[PDB]
Amino acid sequence: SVFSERTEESSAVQYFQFYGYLSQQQNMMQDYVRTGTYQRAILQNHTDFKDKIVLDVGCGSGILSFFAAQAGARKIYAVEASTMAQHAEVLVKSNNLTDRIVVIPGKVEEVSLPEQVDIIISEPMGYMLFNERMLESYLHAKKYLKPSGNMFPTIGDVHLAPFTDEQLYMEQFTKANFWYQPSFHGVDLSALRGAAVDEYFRQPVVDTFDIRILMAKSVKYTVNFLEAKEGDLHRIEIPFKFHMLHSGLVHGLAFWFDVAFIGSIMTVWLSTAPTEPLTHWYQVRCLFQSPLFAKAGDTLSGTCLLIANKRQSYDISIVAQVDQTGSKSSNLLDLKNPFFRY
Template structure:
């Protein structure tokens, strides 16, 4: 069926048994019982825009207590940074951060949103009788014209591994509207990485390709694609949570100062690492998580996605090595992680790792835009 503007219109009954997953960078598969619906978008941007204009998606964001409470605490504990100030809310979504800024005393908030969610944000602003203090600007921050220079820029630009979806570039771009000595909330972020050992995860991921070993699938031999399937699956970062005991060394961190970093700095980031192993065993890959800090004049508030902290919608990310590396207690694992921005609103991850004492090395190239979710949580898929 087609609507008057030639957009596809369909009906699909859903229930709590519905399962959904992202398929590549531009498709989404919904399954209920024996019925499946594949949504295909012309571009990765179309996929992102569609789901971030859905109230169901924003409901899941607002129901993340840790995320919401941390932002409100960071803003209200630094009330003096917002009182009688002009604030810019980048990629505002539902506008919840704009409301927090008003609670802290901001006289004017410019809430910027480029997707259709902006119409709902306007309704919330009007219904809360704040139209005189919160003005919704529809469009990308790179394209809109902000009426005033601002004292504070607030946003939630974080995706998986901090950088997925590349909203951080828009956050940094917005500094062109920031007054001298203005504030950025968040102020800086740390990407953490550490080696892990998890034999079960490695073999479970490897076994996903065993489907393609079948030589008589309804009379068809699929085995010629087994190698290609294995390579594709190993290019997928794994979104999950894990026990801290699987980590084999203290983490190394890469710091990004949002007050100083330039947009071009995010196009290519090389993170060198040297880990001293705290236990002997097989290194199956590298685990990633991030922290962000809200540095105000009265208080510094942290939001952490570390495995030692309560689980957030960002979970953690694990990237498998193509071949596990054996290392002994006290030996060092060195190498680099190269994060290269791509045209799919995400990053390619290139990992190289060497056990210095033995010379054994391994690595992998992964696509952060196409992760594998080791748990069923559809609300977190677009992150």
């Protein structure tokens, strides 16, 4: 399929085994901001569901399907690829909704649906929006969408901003410096220090932070899911140009995202910004191996380039330069192996 061609089999097994656990389902459902915002987006746009056909892409436990049912959908096809499908079917029976929710086991790239749908709903966002590459399956499912059909969420904004955090930089550098030791039980490890720093700094840091550390207005990159094709997400180029508001060492870039549910009645936002209440996505920070010194008024420019890989993630390349001084930094991150610092 379109799914097995872009996905190493090893990565798919680990991925669907992880989402087959009820404990993981629980962890996600207990995020009140996530769950409540989805429910609000769906129930406040009830006209977009009432007597319509809906597709739920990666239904999980089946919670979004239940919300579409609460809003008055005629029928909901809830497609799910893990063994979680069997547990969803149990819930559909015990909440007396077999007349309205049909669980279809399989990947959305491989199953067959009896009709076209009026609207597609999903929670495809990962860390930094793009991790897990579930946006591709969400976009692929537009093949079942009637003309003039809607998608929930409808748009996604990735936000990035430069940050200063000496203590985070020093935690990571200190761990790597284990490999400086000229005589670890009589053995010199120091020839691996370079490799060790690379490995530590390749890992993005997932946790929250005070907005006081951000040193510029954020830059926005927008994906419109109604218009995007699957292929737009194999290579994502995000140019940026920050105007620094504070002088200091810039230790890397912080990422967060917003999605919007653009209904007929109203638009609802789900934000993972650090100014907003916390979600289980936190925020994500990509440290530079060497910090860059920038004076207030200076311009920090460059590119964030995400290239999709077969382990359902992205290789991230960030190249940044201070324009006034020509101080440059280049960094490669591996979004599959993040560091959960919370």
